[PDB]
Design a protein around this ligand. Structure first.
Ligand SMILES: COc1cc2c(Nc3cc(Cl)c(OC)c(Cl)c3)c(C#N)cnc2cc1OCCCN1CCN(C)CC1
Length: 294
């Protein structure tokens, strides 16, 4: 796209790779001849759930159906066609993941004024926030449930040759009754992407060791989930680098933090944290273990 005639050109339009009956947006509360954006006119903005260089995520109430949702709004208008294509790919990735009970559902998406909006179901707190609120290691009964549900999500992605690439507590969202959903598909890739790459990098704390050499595969997510579960089960801050980062990628489980794990949970984490991706367990293989079935 960067050598194509796509530069220095140019109101809401639906974003959907699947295909739609219409790219026009309508809503109770929305009049396209008023100057406010579709987002401003069509939602009650209740609170800001998150913010960063990417933009902002809001908790909102839809005027179309009176229900609660999350809406992510990008920070500033598209830089150009490559930035636009990268950001719209997130919608495509949702549509490639589709509907699955352990994956956050995308309700709709649109662009207006160079800004991209993604509207998802509203979940409970992120696993990161839940652990902050708990203020301690999570009880293992909770951990097993979150591990199972996130593995079910990964098995769904991986069977279709998709790699999430940023599995971490901030991208897992609690539901009722001890369940959770994997979200945030902004870094997701379809392997053999025609060809291989380009790729953006996930949080270094959770990154699989083989990614340092550019070896991208579904195994990477199993490793990242392994460290996610180690962190929440042990209330253990993960290093971004240095000796400790290396050690966690050489089979080390720090005794001061991990001695209180059940033997069963420790065993499963060792399988997930295997440094060699060719030896690391798959999500399907982990879900077949009896400890993960009940
Ligand atoms: C950070 O909080 C939440 C983020 C959520 C979230 N992220 C997200 C990511 C991305 Cl990449 C998106 O773009 C596709 C979009 Cl649109 C949303 C999705 C999703 N997906 C769904 N549901 C969420 C719910 C949240 O918090 C609910 C509890 C709030 N409560 C906790 C107690 N505290 C004192 C007050 C705040």
């Amino acid at each position: 796209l960067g050598t194509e005639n796509l530069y220095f050109q140019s109101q809401p339009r639906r974003v959907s790779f699947r295909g739609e009956a219409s790219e026009t947006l309508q809503s109770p509360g929305y009049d396209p001849s008023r100057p406010e954006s579709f987002f401003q006119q069509s939602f009650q903005r209740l609170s800001r759930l998150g913010h960063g260089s990417y933009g902002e995520v809001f908790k909102v109430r839809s005027k179309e159906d009176g229900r609660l949702y999350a809406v992510k709004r990008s920070m500033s208008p598209f830089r150009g066609p490559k930035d636009r294509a990268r950001k719209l790919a997130e919608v495509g990735s949702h549509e490639k993941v589709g509907q699955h009970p352990c994956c956050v559902r995308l309700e709709q998406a649109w662009e207006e004024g160079g800004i991209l909006y993604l509207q998802t179901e509203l979940c409970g707190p992120s696993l990161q926030q839940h652990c902050e609120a708990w203020g301690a290691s999570l009880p293992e009964a909770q951990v097993w449930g979150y591990l199972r549900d996130t593995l079910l999500a990964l098995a769904h992605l991986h069977s279709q040759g998709l790699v999430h690439l940023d599995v971490k507590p901030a991208n897992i969202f609690l539901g009722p009754r001890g369940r959770c959903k994997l979200g945030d598909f902004g870094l997701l890739v379809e392997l053999g992407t025609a060809g291989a790459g380009e790729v953006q990098e996930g949080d270094p704390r959770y990154m699989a060791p083989e990614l340092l050499q550019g070896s991208y595969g579904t195994a990477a997510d199993v490793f990242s989930l392994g460290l996610t579960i180690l962190e929440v089960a042990c209330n253990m801050e993960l290093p971004h680098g240095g000796e400790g980062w290396q050690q966690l990628r050489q089979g080390y489980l720090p005794p001061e933090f991990t001695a209180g794990l059940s033997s069963e949970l420790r065993s499963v984490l060792v399988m997930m944290l295997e440094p060699d991706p060719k030896l690391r367990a798959t999500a399907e293989a982990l879900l077949a273990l009896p400890v993960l079935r009940q």
